[PDB]
Design a binder for this molecule. Structure first.
Ligand SMILES: Nc1cc(CNC(=O)[C@@H]2CCCN2C(=O)[C@H](N)Cc2ccccc2)ccn1
Ligand SMILES: [Ca+2]
Length: 223
């Protein structure tokens, strides 16, 4: 997260870190057994880390649970990032508490202008590299479809939305991939892609979760 702020420990209790020897992506806990992340975060050997603030120190509220299965969306296209969503099943159910909590799925799509919360442990620099240990947060509005398409001509599908600031300076970034965009208490977006981080006229692009609720519900009912 570039241009954001320190969230405060466990104030984003649905945020997960995906670990394969090191943090590589975020995700969102949607019930005690399932995490939503980005399809571009797929890899084998995932451990889900819940209850994290400092990802380099055991602070006492974590739960570390291996994934038993990952399900990338059947229509994910890794060239266009259309349908950039993946479900991860936990080998055992998380113990839900004030520091480890699920985030609701949306029942309607969020509106342009709505302010959302984006979070993660990704790079905090727009030029150069610095990775934080504690969770970072950014408040950002959903942008109009026309401004999103003008920023990324020929690249925005109906399964994507832009959020952020056309002036630059505030954005998600590498390492925030797969993490949540929460608006009105619902998971409306997944950190997906952008052209650099926090660059002028290049806001973040996010998977539009409301288009996937039927797939998520049917998949978790059968796996
Ligand atoms: N708001 C954001 C969020 C992010 C997080 N996402 C990434 O870092 C992803 C992971 C793979 C690379 N990438 C990019 O977004 C590439 N720039 C484009 C690209 C995409 C896919 C393959 C190659 C290139 C980055 C930037 N602004
Ligand atoms: Ca920790």
């Amino acid at each position: 997260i570039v241009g954001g702020y320190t969230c405060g420990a466990n104030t984003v209790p649905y945020q997960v870190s995906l670990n394969s020897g090191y943090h590589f992506c975020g995700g969102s806990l949607i019930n005690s057994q399932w995490v939503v992340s980005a399809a571009h975060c797929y890899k084998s050997g995932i451990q889900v880390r819940l209850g994290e603030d400092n990802i380099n120190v055991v602070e006492g509220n974590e739960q570390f649970i291996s994934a038993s299965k990952s399900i990338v969306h059947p229509s994910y296209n890794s060239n266009t990032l259309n349908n950039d969503i993946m479900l991860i099943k936990l080998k055992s159910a998380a113990s839900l508490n004030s520091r480890v909590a699920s985030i609701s799925l949306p029942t309607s799509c969020a509106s342009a202008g709505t302010q959302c919360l984006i979070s993660g442990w990704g790079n905090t620099k727009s030029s150069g590299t610095s990775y934080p240990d504690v969770l970072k947060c950014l408040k950002a509005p959903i942008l109009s479809d026309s401004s999103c398409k003008s920023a990324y001509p020929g690249q925005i599908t109906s399964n994507m939305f832009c959020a952020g600031y056309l002036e630059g300076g505030k954005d998600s970034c590498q390492g925030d991939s797969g993490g949540p965009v929460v608006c009105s208490g619902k998971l409306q977006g997944i950190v997906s892609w952008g052209s650099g981080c926090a660059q002028k006229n290049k806001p973040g692009v996010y998977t539009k979760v409301c288009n996937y609720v039927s797939w998520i519900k049917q998949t978790i009912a059968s796996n």
